[PDB]
Design a protein around this nucleic acid. Structure first.
Ligand SMILES: [Mg+2]
Ligand SMILES: [Mg+2]
Ligand SMILES: [Mg+2]
Ligand SMILES: [Mg+2]
Ligand SMILES: [Mg+2]
Ligand SMILES: [Mg+2]
Ligand SMILES: [Mg+2]
Ligand SMILES: [Mg+2]
Lengths: 244, 94, 114, 69, 60, 91
RNA sequence: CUGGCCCUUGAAAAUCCGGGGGAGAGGGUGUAAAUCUCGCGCCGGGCCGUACCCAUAUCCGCAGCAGGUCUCCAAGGUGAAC
RNA sequence: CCAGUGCGGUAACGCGACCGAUCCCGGAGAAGCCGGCGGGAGCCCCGGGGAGAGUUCUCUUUUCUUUGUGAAGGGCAGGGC
RNA sequence: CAGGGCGAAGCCAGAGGAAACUCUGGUGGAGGUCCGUAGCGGUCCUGACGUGCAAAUCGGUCGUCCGACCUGGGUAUAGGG
């Protein structure tokens, strides 16, 4: 009868993302002469960290090669980047940690992060806190390249798009146990209102389809059609297997 | 290597440890081997490397730490740079 | 003891109502409303933590009343950089140019040889 | 208020257009000469009680000398 | 009447076990009898050194 | 083994959270409140500022390291491999 | 001042400021532009709020209703102590 | 006949003013919580002078009250670097 | 968001040991830690009251009291929502 939590995360307005103190988008410096033909320069200012993200950001100062000014960016810092390092960008850049190149240039097996899935979108893939994406193999004509993502899936990408070299800094954030309910509330209090999650079996059948009963049992198979209406589509969504 | 020859200089010859004392002995001119280490901020490297070239002094980029230079100099502490004034029996000077 | 009271219609201790005791010539301890503690300028190099020298640390809109010499110190980059990072930016802007001359003649000898 | 330290100095400040009402308190060895001006009130603290009565006969034009008591 | 009592507490009257109510640490914090003590011995060794009583290597 | 046998840092968590979790957190809680030696100035001043960001007290360097150690092993084995891939390409 | 804690890193803008740079301005042997002007002098600052209660009888609970309602100041004694 | 967009200190920096636009760089505004310690203050206290009180059957140099300097300048303490 | 208790890492000495390191005495002040004010809560008497002071209050006793703590104003979400 009611509208189940999960249906409500869409309207927002409470279930909305918590973003006052966030330092700004973690982007990748869109393209020009410098990226498409040369090797524009720039130095690292600081490694300030943003709330709600395990990776530290880096304010990298280039200088705009068209008007006397100083463009400043926010790169997801590759592990090893320090303050004062020179980060070089573009096609003619050389292969070492923190230099953004086009994946077409660097050899196979290179370990990159903050990759783009379409050319120019300023960095989308493999940028979480400790993830990387290994370049697999090239294809000179058709200008495509095969890339392995942290999920283990392999994706064919156009050789143009760029990606910084190295791994994302802050690896192993999942290794230390949260260890107390305080540290969880205190952790999501920087991301959005998705915390203490009530299991459906504890709600009355008007609020969640797994409800009701004189015992706290589910009642119907917890695997559910992918072609489900919103509101039923709860539990194991379109599970192919189910079990360890 | 130069863990052996330097070990002899400290014991027998004269030497100056550091900077603003090394730089004052290249200023005077009475020093003829400045042993930088890595981990010296490349500004103080390039400025001693040039300040010494002007006085015709050999520079040496010891593959050290600024710690594996004090350990090499029989000292118990941190030496980033150093300038050898006079050798003993050590042919640290070529 | 006589106890005292706030003086403006504000009664919430804040960064605004920050007070102090004073003894007037009527033998009357009274609240006096202080000014926020101003901070001296930090270096523009971005590495030295200490606030500068030779500048009055005072709330920013006050720098309009003050004189020119109270706000700076007479050097290159004075009043904005810390002079430990100035004397570096001099002898760093030296050898960057000098080893651009050195690569200029090593490039002129590499093409003179080839 | 500003304390003037020199006898000659307020002899200039007491000749201004804005000056008026040179007030003279006798403080038992501190005989003071407060000259009201637009901005400030310059006072001289004389220590020698003779030099003070000599200065009494120097207020040039007929200022509003009000011997304070 | 209070000032006559405090003249007894000077000589240690009404200070017995039967009139203590806080812990020994609450009445005189063992944390404070570092700063009282360590400051006294340190200020002694400082006056002893600048007085050429003891040398640097004895003092350290 | 003075003041305790085998809890050390995580004595602060008291009886709570279970042994196997307090124990596992120990090695971590040691390597993050640890002060490492800066590989620029040599001085033992590398301290953890927040997750993956490590600051040197002396020379005011800030470094993007691991979550609670200066270097993840994954990043060190990448740095050696990335360095060999560019020497293999350009020689 | 100096610490600890964080898978928490803990506000923006008006406003004001120093510095880089150095286009241009200045008078031509006593003056001149200029004074992020040093001292001093002249003139101006309009419009709205401003009583009193702030509560076991002025507020809300049908009321001078043991309910409810955000703060500031805060002595002597005993005691560890608001 | 030329010179003169202020001078001092080796340096931190100092001096009352010290030519200057578009543009550029930076600072201030601009930061959590908690622990410890030091400096200043107000108040509290103790010893001693004044002034006015209270008690005085006996005793108490007694007990009580009161005993001041604003912003804004100017100078120097004592803190911090 | 009194005053206390327990007393973690770190650190210092002293003592053993060949070495690993282990003892002893301090420091140190950690924690969804304990007692316990203020605050917030509302267990038990199945107390008071039950045409009440009150359309849910009142006593004694209680829970928690540096954190998933308590709060003021501003702002968001509106009826099969
Ligand atoms: Mg139920
Ligand atoms: Mg249903
Ligand atoms: Mg306000
Ligand atoms: Mg100055
Ligand atoms: Mg009023
Ligand atoms: Mg009952
Ligand atoms: Mg009845
Ligand atoms: Mg009644």
């Amino acid at each position: 009868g009611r509208v189940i939590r999960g249906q409500r995360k869409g309207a927002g307005s409470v279930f909305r993302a918590h973003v006052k103190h966030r330092k700004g988008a973690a982007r990748l410096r869109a393209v020009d002469f410098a990226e498409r033909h040369g090797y524009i320069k720039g130095i690292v200012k600081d490694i300030i960290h943003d709330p709600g993200r395990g990776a530290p950001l880096a304010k990298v100062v280039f200088r705009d090669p068209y008007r006397f000014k100083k463009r400043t960016e926010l790169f997801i810092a590759a592990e090893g980047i320090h303050t004062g390092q020179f980060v070089y960008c573009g096609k003619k850049a050389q292969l070492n940690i923190g230099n953004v190149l086009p994946v077409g240039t660097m050899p196979e097996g290179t370990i990159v992060c903050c990759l783009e899935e379409k050319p120019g979108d300023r960095g989308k893939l493999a940028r979480a806190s400790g993830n990387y994406a290994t370049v697999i193999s090239h294809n000179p004509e058709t200008k495509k390249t095969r890339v392995k993502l942290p999920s283990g899936s392999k994706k064919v990408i156009s050789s143009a798009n760029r990606a910084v070299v190295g791994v994302v800094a802050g690896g192993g954030r999942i290794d230390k146990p949260i260890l107390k309910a305080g540290r969880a509330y205190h952790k999501y209090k920087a991301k959005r209102n998705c915390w203490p999650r009530v299991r459906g079996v504890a709600m009355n059948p008007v609020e969640h389809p797994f409800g009701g009963g004189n015992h706290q049992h589910i009642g119907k198979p917890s695997t559910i059609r992918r072609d489900a209406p919103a509101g039923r589509k709860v539990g194991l969504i379109a599970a192919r297997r189910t079990g360890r | 290597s130069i863990n052996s020859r330097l070990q002899l200089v400290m014991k027998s010859g004269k030497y100056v440890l550091g900077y603003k004392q090394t730089l004052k002995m290249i200023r005077q001119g009475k020093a003829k081997l400045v042993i930088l280490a890595n981990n010296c901020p490349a500004l103080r490297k390039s400025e001693i490397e040039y300040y010494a070239m002007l006085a015709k002094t050999g520079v040496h980029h010891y593959s050290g730490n600024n710690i594996e230079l004090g350990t090499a100099c029989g000292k118990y502490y941190r030496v980033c740079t150093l300038a050898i004034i006079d050798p003993g029996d050590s042919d640290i000077i070529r | 003891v006589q106890r005292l009271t706030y003086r403006r219609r504000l009664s919430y201790n804040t960064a605004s109502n920050k007070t102090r005791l004073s003894r007037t010539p009527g033998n009357r301890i009274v609240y006096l409303y202080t000014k926020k503690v101003g901070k001296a300028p930090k270096s523009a190099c971005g590495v030295c933590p200490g606030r500068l020298r030779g500048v009055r640390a005072v709330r920013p809109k006050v720098l309009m009343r003050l004189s020119k010499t109270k706000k700076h110190v007479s050097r290159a980059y004075g009043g904005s950089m810390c002079a430990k990072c100035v004397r570096d930016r001099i002898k760093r802007a030296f050898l960057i140019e000098e080893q651009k001359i050195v690569v200029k003649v090593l490039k002129a000898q590499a093409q003179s040889q080839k | 208020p500003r304390k003037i330290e020199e006898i000659k100095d307020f002899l200039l400040t007491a000749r201004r257009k804005d000056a008026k009402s040179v007030k003279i308190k006798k403080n038992k060895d501190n005989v003071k000469f407060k000259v009201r001006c637009s901005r400030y009130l310059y006072t001289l603290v004389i220590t020698d009680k003779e030099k003070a009565e000599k200065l009494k006969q120097s207020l040039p034009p007929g200022l509003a000398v009000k011997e304070l008591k | 009447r209070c000032r006559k009592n405090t003249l007894a507490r000077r000589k240690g009257r009404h200070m017995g076990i039967g009139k203590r109510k806080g812990t020994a640490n609450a009445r005189m914090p063992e944390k404070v009898t570092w700063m009282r003590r360590m400051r006294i011995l340190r200020r002694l060794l400082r006056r002893y050194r600048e007085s050429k009583k003891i040398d640097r290597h004895m003092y350290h | 083994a003075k003041r305790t046998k085998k809890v050390g840092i995580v004595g602060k968590y008291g009886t709570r959270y279970g042994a196997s979790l307090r124990k596992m957190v120990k090695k971590i809680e040691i390597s993050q409140h640890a002060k490492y030696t800066c590989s620029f100035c040599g001085k033992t001043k590398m301290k953890r500022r927040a997750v993956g960001i490590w600051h040197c007290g002396s020379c005011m360097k800030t470094v993007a390291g691991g979550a609670w150690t200066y270097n993840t092993t994954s990043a060190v084995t990448v740095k050696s491999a990335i360095r060999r891939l560019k020497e293999l390409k350009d020689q």
